Curated annotation (Swiss-Prot):
Family: Belongs to the WAL family.
Full protein: residues contained: 2054 to 2166 of 2168
Name of the protein in question: Bromodomain adjacent to zinc finger domain protein 2B
Gene, per the UniProt record: BAZ2B
Bromo domain residues: 9-113
Tissues expressed in: Expressed at varying levels in several tissues, whereas a smaller transcript was expressed specifically in testis.
Subunit annotation: Component of the BRF-1 ISWI chromatin remodeling complex, at least composed of SMARCA1 and BAZ2B, which regulates the spacing of histone octamers on the DNA template to facilitate access to DNA. Within the BRF-1 ISWI chromatin remodeling complex interacts with SMARCA1; the interaction is direct. Component of the BRF-5 ISWI chromatin remodeling complex, at least composed of SMARCA5/SNF2H and BAZ2B, which regulates the spacing of histone octamers on the DNA template to facilitate access to DNA.
Subcellular locations according to the entry: Nucleus
Annotated function: Regulatory subunit of the ATP-dependent BRF-1 and BRF-5 ISWI chromatin remodeling complexes, which form ordered nucleosome arrays on chromatin and facilitate access to DNA during DNA-templated processes such as DNA replication, transcription, and repair. Both complexes regulate the spacing of nucleosomes along the chromatin and have the ability to slide mononucleosomes to the center of a DNA template. The BRF-1 ISWI chromatin remodeling complex has a lower ATP hydrolysis rate than the BRF-5 ISWI chromatin remodeling complex.
Amino acid sequence: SMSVKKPKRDDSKDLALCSMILTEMETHEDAWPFLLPVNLKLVPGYKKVIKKPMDFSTIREKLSSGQYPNLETFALDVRLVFDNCETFNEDDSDIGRAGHNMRKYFEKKWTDTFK
């Protein structure tokens, strides 16, 4: 409350460390469905169904331009990429499996880097 604060967690390295995580997600062999925005002209149903499209290149541009106020808003967009994938793709599909694998990969890096 006013003039009453928990001790200050060092967040000075968060930007660099989110960038490194994102590099590792970019270079994963199963990243290919997530590298670029879904083409809304060429994929019937995507625009209407997926209210907030998100992809790794869009996260990279947001990160690089100071559009993440803190490390939690960064994690929310990464998770959005996988929630969207689950919304639109069957589990038993190459893309569906890619999304589960990448979400797992992400959540471990996240816990190991920050928890």
